[PDB]
């Protein structure tokens, strides 16, 4: 998964001939084309040129063409930092997420996720885990990939996990909670539905929809207390917390629907009289090492198809750029 | 006739300074969150809309973190949650976001409205783009969120005319005259209108 | 006079002396003053109870169906007045203050009760 692109549609091999054109067209307050941004990004052979692109993609993110940041312009940047470091300044676009604004929601996310653990990368694979959690993804077998990895640091870091990183824990499992294949893909939702429900009565209902894509209905224990019956029509975290709330600011709900602190007796007996059906019909970190070779047939077929859709792109846009120099 | 050579040339020079050094959205749609005023204007927001700016979040500061700036995504207003459980929302087709603005928001966009389930073609501009009453629909539970399912008598004195005109013209016709409602449409006060009917100050 | 985006309104006008009101409904432009010039003249409204107690109104309701027929906006007190008669239905704010004074007489039935 390296030398598929790197026959790279050969071109000019300079930077100072082009680093004084983009800002010159920035200081004239003119827009900048989406073709002239790429020709610095392919010219990366150093880390001094990495912060050259950080001084340029910042100003092109804040350009009147806030669109036309094309997906391969991200990906041709994904090659260079995987080439050089893939440790710190490769990440430092994705943390701010708006002063550069890539969003490469593809197989391009996974190429810097699998190249993480090749150094075993325990710290810098906590972040992109959280930063593709917020972005719209998970129509891909990378649903297996993050779920294999959130249960690497569920086994590693063991605290109250934060004020708001407890909410970051559950939010990274439900959007990969799309797994009709196995019961642990449904027993992964019971993990996240639990500790998203623990912030319901300590920290507020608004804490689940700050920035992260979750909805405003106040029941997430009851989104867990209904689907485990569907698994029972076909989990040791919820045992602590459901008694924990029963142990010892703007109001936006209604005076007839109850504030759900008063449904904790109907939260115990609705759950505790139901887990016996799993005992009547019929640990996790090993179950993700089963799917690693079961599925994951490595969808490179649409990757190289995207490489041919991009060869449809860059030669036709350059065919435009040649017209605006001869007609003048 | 004495022509106004000055008052003619003084009109383009306002029309080329409401066009050249106009301030954009970025410098007049920020809000102080500690005094509740505005930069460059100073005019405080009414006390009915204090929490929505202070404690909730805008549209394009929610839409500043998505690929293609939400090329077809769904957006719901904060009030539309609290007034109608019926699905009222937009879709999107185009965005024209600002560039001077740090921490991108305040831009321009347009898309497709669906009011409490009643959809419409002819994509127009969104209302309240700078307003902080906005929430995003996540694509987990996206399909069931969008799940949807005479004539009046006259006031008495105008009633007293038509019955007398019948008695004048020839027929008794003790049929009551019934003016209709069924042409007059009843869109609510919560319906967002078109944007470029308004002008930006 | 050229008024930037003017519409037509059916307003009331003062024409009496001090402490003697006398109203008179007029078809006019929106931005001309209350006492000022009208487009066309309509009936008078007498707010003072005359001999043996009547509050008199005149309404030529042939030309107001020519003027509200031609899309004239109204004034709120005249909006109540055709509901007090029956050319229009009754205004909601006239219904509320009818109920409010009733509810302000429904606090009188406990102030009368708690003394005797």
């Amino acid at each position: 998964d390296s030398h598929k692109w790197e026959a790279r549609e050969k071109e000019h091999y300079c930077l100072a001939d082009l680093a004084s054109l983009m800002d010159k067209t920035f200081e004239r307050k003119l827009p900048v084309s989406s073709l002239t941004i790429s020709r610095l990004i392919d010219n990366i052979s150093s880390r001094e040129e990495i912060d050259h692109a950080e001084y340029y993609l910042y100003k092109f993110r804040h350009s009147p063409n806030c669109w036309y940041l094309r997906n391969w312009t991200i990906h041709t940047w994904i090659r260079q930092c995987l080439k050089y470091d893939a440790q710190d300044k490769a990440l430092y676009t994705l943390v701010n997420k708006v002063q550069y604004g890539i969003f490469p929601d593809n197989f391009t996310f996974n190429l810097l996720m699998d190249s993480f653990i090749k150094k075993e990368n325990y710290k810098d694979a906590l972040s992109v885990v959280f930063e593709v959690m917020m972005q719209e993804a998970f129509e891909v077998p990378s649903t297996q990939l993050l779920s294999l990895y959130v249960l690497f640091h569920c086994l590693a870091k063991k605290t109250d996990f934060s004020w708001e990183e407890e909410r970051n824990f559950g939010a990274s499992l439900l959007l990969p909670g799309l797994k009709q294949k196995n019961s642990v893909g449904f027993s992964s939702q019971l993990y996240g539905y639990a500790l998203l429900g623990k912030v319901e009565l300590q920290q507020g209902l608004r804490a689940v929809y700050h920035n992260m894509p979750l909805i405003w209905k106040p029941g997430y224990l009851d989104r867990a207390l209904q689907v485990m019956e569907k698994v029972a029509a076909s989990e040791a975290l919820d045992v602590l917390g459901a008694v924990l709330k029963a142990l010892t600011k703007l109001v936006e709900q209604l005076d007839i629907e109850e504030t759900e602190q008063s449904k904790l007796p109907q939260y115990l007996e609705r759950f505790k009289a139901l887990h016996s059906k799993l005992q009547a019909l019929g640990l996790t970190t090993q179950l993700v090492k089963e799917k690693l070779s079961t599925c994951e047939a490595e969808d490179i077929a649409t990757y190289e198809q995207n490489l041919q859709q991009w060869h449809l792109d860059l030669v036709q846009l350059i065919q435009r750029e040649q017209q605006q120099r001869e007609q003048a | 006739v004495r022509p106004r050579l000055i008052a003619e040339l003084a009109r383009r020079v306002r029309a080329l300074r409401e066009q050249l050094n106009r301030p954009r959205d970025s410098q007049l749609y920020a809000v102080d969150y500690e005094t509740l005023t505005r930069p460059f204007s100073g005019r405080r927001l009414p006390v009915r809309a204090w929490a929505d700016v202070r404690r909730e979040s805008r549209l394009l500061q929610l839409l500043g973190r998505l690929p293609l700036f939400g090329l077809g995504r769904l957006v719901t207003r904060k009030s539309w949650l609290w007034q109608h459980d019926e699905p009222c929302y937009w879709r999107l087709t185009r965005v024209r976001p600002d560039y001077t603005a740090q921490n991108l928001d305040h831009g321009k966009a347009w898309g497709i409205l669906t009011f409490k389930g009643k959809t419409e073609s002819e994509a127009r501009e969104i209302e309240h783009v700078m307003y902080h009453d906005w929430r995003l629909v996540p694509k987990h539970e996206e399909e069931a969120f969008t799940a949807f399912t005479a004539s009046v008598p006259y006031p008495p004195l105008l009633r007293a005319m038509i019955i007398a005109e019948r008695q004048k013209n020839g027929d008794t016709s003790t049929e009551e005259p019934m003016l209709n409602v069924q042409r007059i449409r009843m869109e609510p006060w919560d319906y967002p209108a078109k944007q470029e009917d308004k002008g930006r100050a | 006079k050229a008024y930037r985006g003017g519409h037509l309104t059916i307003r009331l006008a003062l024409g009496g002396c001090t402490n003697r009101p006398f109203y008179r409904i007029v078809a006019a432009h929106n931005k001309c003053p209350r006492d000022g010039r009208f487009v066309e003249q309509l009936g008078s409204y007498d707010p003072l109870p005359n001999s043996h107690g009547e509050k008199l109104v005149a309404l030529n309701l042939d030309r107001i169906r020519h003027w509200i027929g031609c899309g004239a906006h109204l004034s709120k007190p005249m909006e109540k007045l055709l509901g007090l008669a029956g050319f229009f239905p009754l205004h909601p704010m006239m219904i509320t203050n009818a109920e409010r004074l009733r509810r302000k007489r429904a606090r009188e039935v406990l102030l009368a009760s708690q003394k005797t």
């Binding site: 703007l250 109001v251 936006e252 709900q253 209604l254 005076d255 007839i256 | 609290w82 007034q83 | 109920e99 009733r102 509810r103 007489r105 429904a106 009188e108 039935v109």
Partner: peptide, 29 residues
């Protein structure tokens, strides 16, 4: 009104509310 919409206004103005009665009466002497 149905009592759910009566509470719906009570959702909006929690800092500024008065209390009230139901029906207005029939007559007054």
């Amino acid at each position: 009104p149905p009592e759910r919409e009566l509470s719906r206004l009570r959702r909006l103005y929690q800092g500024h509310l008065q209390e009230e009665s139901g029906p207005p009466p029939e007559s007054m002497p």
